[PDB]
Amino acid sequence: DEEILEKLRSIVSVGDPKKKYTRFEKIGQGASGTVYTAMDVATGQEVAIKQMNLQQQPKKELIINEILVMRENKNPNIVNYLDSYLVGDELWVVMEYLAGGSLTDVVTETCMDEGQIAAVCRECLQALEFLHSNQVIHRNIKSDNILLGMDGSVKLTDFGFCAQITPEQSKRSEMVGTPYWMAPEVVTRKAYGPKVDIWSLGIMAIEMIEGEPPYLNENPLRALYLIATNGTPELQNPEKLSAIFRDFLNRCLEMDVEKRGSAKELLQHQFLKIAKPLSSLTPLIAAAKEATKNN
């Protein structure tokens, strides 16, 4: 529709990004747009800006929904929205910039100890508690969507797949997310809720342990089948984990949605009590950057 486009345009101001921001440097590109780093002229704040051609963009309703969700869900454990501009047919969206890279770089190139894993899980559960208390389900938790500051701060990004629920409609039933990280009830199209994010967090903790989510060697379709049929995945070497870490994982990856922990109750779990300070993550960030120099 041209109606859905006009609705998208209406929630964005018309203006020039260069009035407030400079030193644009392209760090990425794709169909969904070009991504730059840039700087706030008045404050010196480094920012991340996405340039997007609106005409060609499919499923504009998801762009409307992401912008709306960010504007009303600002939090220290989220990669926050700063501003947006319309210029001609292109949309510019300004976000905080995190210079420490993604958690994916860390889990694929380093060995995290349990204190560092507990820290990351805590910060993520803080974001999830905030989101769920505002009836937002992320539905795409994975290390790729966890970004790190150079001080070890931990923030969640990418709200392109999130669902807003209501007491009227408090559950969803559609297969949305990234296969390896999807909870069984999502994969098999049952009525589901916020605890699907708790499952995906459990899979991300398996990333921090083993380097990959379960079945990454398989194609996405085979992985969906395996999740549906196996339920709670198995660790290669559970012997290597503490009793309290194993219990934390079990409570994230519980098949029974009523038995699975909420974000609020996992924030009280004993595993998080051994978390190291976030400064402990900066050597991992340094390692990850070194590892990925050649790409």
Ligand X SMILES: CCNc1ncc2cc(-c3ccc(-c4cncc(C)n4)cc3Cl)c(=O)n(C[C@H]3CC[C@H](N)CC3)c2n1
Chain residues binding ligand X by CB under 6 A are: 35, 48-50, 52, 63, 66-67, 70, 79, 93, 95, 97-98, 101-102, 144-145, 147, 157-158
Identify which of 113, 62, 167 has the alpha carbon closest to the alpha carbon of residue 280: 113
Closest distance to ligand X from the beta carbon of 4 (Å): 15
Cβ–Cβ under 8 Å, residues 65 and 139? no
Q: Give the residue with the Cβ less far from ligand X, 49 or 249.
A: 49
The least distance separating ligand X from the CB of residue 293, rounded to whole angstroms, comes to 15
Q: Report the residue number, 179 or 184, with the smaller CB distance to ligand X.
A: 179
Of 54 and 235, the one with the shorter C-beta distance to ligand X is 54
CA atoms within 13 A on the CB side of 103: 30
Instruction: Tell the smallest beta-carbon distance from residue 85 to ligand X (Å).
Output: 12
Instruction: Tell me how far apart the alpha carbons of residues 84 and 5 are, in angstroms, rounded to a whole number.
Output: 16
Cβ proximity to ligand X: between 104 and 262 the closer is 104
- When the beta carbons of 146 and 186 are compared against ligand X, the nearer one is 146
| Closest CB 23 distance from ligand X, rounded Å | 15
- Separation of alpha carbons 96 and 46, rounded Å: 7
C-alpha distances (whole Å) from 83 to each of 14, 39, 229 are 11, 13, 44
In angstroms, give the least distance from the CB of 124 to ligand X: 15
Q: Least separation, in Å, of the C-beta of 105 and ligand X?
A: 8
Select 37 or 232, whichever has its Cβ closest to ligand X: 37
